[PDB]
Scaffold this active site. Sequence first.
Site, short mmCIF file in Angstrom:
data_model
loop_
_atom_site.label_atom_id
_atom_site.label_comp_id
_atom_site.label_asym_id
_atom_site.label_seq_id
_atom_site.Cartn_x
_atom_site.Cartn_y
_atom_site.Cartn_z
N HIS A 179 0.80 -1.23 0.00
CA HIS A 179 0.00 0.00 0.00
C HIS A 179 0.83 1.27 0.00
O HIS A 179 0.27 2.36 -0.04
CB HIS A 179 -0.98 -0.03 1.17
CG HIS A 179 -0.35 0.14 2.51
ND1 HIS A 179 -0.07 -0.94 3.32
CD2 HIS A 179 -0.01 1.25 3.21
CE1 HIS A 179 0.43 -0.51 4.47
NE2 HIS A 179 0.52 0.81 4.42
N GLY B 66 3.05 5.31 10.80
CA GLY B 66 4.38 5.22 10.21
C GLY B 66 5.09 3.91 10.49
O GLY B 66 6.21 3.71 10.01
N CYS C 194 4.08 0.79 9.60
CA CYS C 194 3.92 -0.27 8.63
C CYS C 194 5.25 -0.64 8.01
O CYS C 194 6.13 0.21 7.80
CB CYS C 194 2.98 0.15 7.47
SG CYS C 194 1.27 0.14 8.06
C1 LIG Z 1 0.89 1.82 8.48
O1 LIG Z 1 1.80 2.73 8.98
C2 LIG Z 1 0.45 2.36 7.12
O2 LIG Z 1 1.46 2.61 6.14
C3 LIG Z 1 -0.43 1.89 9.33
C4 LIG Z 1 -0.18 1.33 10.75
C5 LIG Z 1 -1.25 1.74 11.75
C6 LIG Z 1 -1.22 3.26 12.03
C7 LIG Z 1 -1.53 3.47 13.52
N1 LIG Z 1 -1.09 2.19 14.05
C8 LIG Z 1 -0.96 1.16 13.15
O3 LIG Z 1 -0.64 0.01 13.40
N2 LIG Z 1 -1.50 1.18 8.68
C9 LIG Z 1 -2.67 1.78 8.31
O4 LIG Z 1 -2.95 2.94 8.50
C10 LIG Z 1 -3.62 0.91 7.60
C11 LIG Z 1 -3.47 1.13 6.06
C12 LIG Z 1 -4.08 0.02 5.21
C13 LIG Z 1 -3.11 -1.13 5.05
C14 LIG Z 1 -4.33 0.53 3.77
N3 LIG Z 1 -4.96 1.25 8.05
C15 LIG Z 1 -5.44 0.69 9.15
O5 LIG Z 1 -4.74 -0.11 9.76
C16 LIG Z 1 -6.80 1.04 9.53
C17 LIG Z 1 -7.85 1.63 8.82
C18 LIG Z 1 -8.95 1.56 9.68
C19 LIG Z 1 -10.26 2.03 9.59
O6 LIG Z 1 -10.44 2.67 8.43
C20 LIG Z 1 -11.77 3.04 8.18
C21 LIG Z 1 -11.15 1.85 10.63
C22 LIG Z 1 -10.76 1.17 11.79
C23 LIG Z 1 -9.48 0.71 11.93
C24 LIG Z 1 -8.60 0.90 10.86
N4 LIG Z 1 -7.29 0.54 10.73
#
Ligand SMILES: *[C@@](O)(CO)[C@H](C[C@@H]1CCNC1=O)NC(=O)[C@H](CC(C)C)NC(=O)c1cc2c(OC)cccc2[nH]1
EC number: 3.4.19.12
Lengths: 299, 303
Positions: free
Chosen positions: A39, A141, A143
């Site tokens: 992503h 940040g 991921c």
């Molecule tokens: C990575 O840093 C993204 O590059 C990020 C990690 C999370 C940020 C805060 N703590 C973490 O572990 N991941 C995300 O933001 C992911 C992105 C996906 C893979 C495209 N998004 C989520 O984990 C996310 C989205 C939602 C949501 O929406 C609507 C509703 C509830 C939970 C949720 N988690």
Amino acid sequence: FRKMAFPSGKVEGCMVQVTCGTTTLNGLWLDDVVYCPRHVICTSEDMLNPNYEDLLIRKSNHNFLVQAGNVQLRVIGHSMQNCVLKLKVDTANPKTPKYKFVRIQPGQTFSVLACYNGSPSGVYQCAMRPNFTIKGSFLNGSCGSVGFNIDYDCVSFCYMHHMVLPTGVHAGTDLEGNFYGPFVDRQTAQAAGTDTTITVNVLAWLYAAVINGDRWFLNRFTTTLNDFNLVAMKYNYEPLTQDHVDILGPLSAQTGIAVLDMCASLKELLQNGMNGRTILGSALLEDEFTPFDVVRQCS
Amino acid sequence: SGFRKMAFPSGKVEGCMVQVTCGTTTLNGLWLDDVVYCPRHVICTSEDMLNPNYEDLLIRKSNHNFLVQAGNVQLRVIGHSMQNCVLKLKVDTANPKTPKYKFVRIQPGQTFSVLACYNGSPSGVYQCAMRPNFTIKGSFLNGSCGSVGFNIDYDCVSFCYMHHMVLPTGVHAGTDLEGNFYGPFVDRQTAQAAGTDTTITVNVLAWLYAAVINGDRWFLNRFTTTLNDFNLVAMKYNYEPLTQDHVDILGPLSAQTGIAVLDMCASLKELLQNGMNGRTILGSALLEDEFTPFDVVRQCSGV
Ligand SMILES: *[C@@](O)(CO)[C@H](C[C@@H]1CCNC1=O)NC(=O)[C@H](CC(C)C)NC(=O)c1cc2c(OC)cccc2[nH]1
Ligand SMILES: *[C@@](O)(CO)[C@H](C[C@@H]1CCNC1=O)NC(=O)[C@H](CC(C)C)NC(=O)c1cc2c(OC)cccc2[nH]1
């Protein structure tokens, strides 16, 4: 007993940052390939409902910024493998350890090196839950941070971080990009199944208690594996597999307590409770130490 | 999201661990620039360790009596001195992986990461707190002496602990990198007791705030308390007094959650008097006191 992580230096030397547009996250640089969550190619709006094959078609090597610190590594090839991107770079990482990619089972533990902008920040031990979540500590940040074990000189990578769930637990993939559990990499609230207690690890903990002279819970009975599994499931405990029985082998030999005798002891603890007693100084049965962790902290 | 006992990444320290051997005694050392630092009781035989006259024992040693191994390489010792309970071996080679570093003496209640090592080889890394009675609840086996504790800020490693001893209660004791013990302990082979082990109150409060930030409020209440009335109850339960500096240090967590520090004190007072009633906080059945306010802020700010 305490959670102990593996020394993190062999992994630290492999962390980079990967940016596409303004989207930045971490990647893992081994030999001349950088592995990262696919992503990174998404804008924020893209992540609501992405078509990754179509989004990737629009990307070329020169759209990927890979940096070791502030030093750019030129990307010379790219491909998708499930939910991970593989970027070939023109420099082989001189700090590449001996490594493998492994897919772990629920109950197994691993160390997480939490990273931000390619920079390692902290290290802690996690266990994969039966519902394929981990109780991590991850901020924006994070991921692409990875989980791993170290055996001799070889780093076995098992986890790459992608998702936080509404309940605040975490989800991710193996290093071939296949999620653990039913999760998908989309900007959506996803629920994990009801969790259960990791039986094999509770048994390892009971062996650890015995090793340390805390053995009041040993009883006179045994059980079959089938009968135990059926009882355990009524207490929200996982069934044991044959691999679980086998990995308890060394602790069973060390203590002289057959695995199925210890299962009969645990069954009594489930059915009758602790009677206000403690085990290793705790009223809670611990389920995040594997048989390997118990051996690793006792010797 | 989440809250976990977290250590600093250990790589900058791993690159400094070596193995020191004198006679049949082997432990770990820390190689910085051209000096290796290790517990002085390496120079001891089993019989010496009962009542070692260290100055007497050291003068009888020669540079070549010390075998320092770094991986597969042996480092030649070209000088040696003693600073309190730490031995300083001058080697003819500067460690190329020496990080920016400082030696600091940590305060009780502060946390640091421990890199546990055996035969000069890093084995595991975990976070500890320096307890009020100057012990640490470590995980150390035979051969762990010379393992070090540290914090990292930017690129600078602040070394604060070097490991020497296990007490009968199973807690651990050691020195700073100037060789002074934390606590009333001595590097002799005797069974030593620590002073009474009080609870780090400001840390318990930080961890309660962490629990709130992570969605758990079951222990909060509508009551408040004055600082002195809280301290009266805390001391009754062998908790350390909360100072106004602690209150201030907790400000950012209070701001983030909207819970006044003295309102969280009133929650803790209730937990101390009533217990937890089989409930858990952040997965624990006990009040945790080994996370500092900054440990919580760095993991939970913005969440
Ligand atoms: C990575 O840093 C993204 O590059 C990020 C990690 C999370 C940020 C805060 N703590 C973490 O572990 N991941 C995300 O933001 C992911 C992105 C996906 C893979 C495209 N998004 C989520 O984990 C996310 C989205 C939602 C949501 O929406 C609507 C509703 C509830 C939970 C949720 N988690
Ligand atoms: C070092 O590795 C020795 O080089 C070692 C670390 C302990 C081994 C088991 N776990 C540890 O943390 N430290 C010692 O063996 C020290 C040596 C001193 C500094 C000379 N001694 C003790 O830890 C010690 C001795 C005694 C004792 O005696 C008699 C009775 C009870 C406890 C105890 N600890």
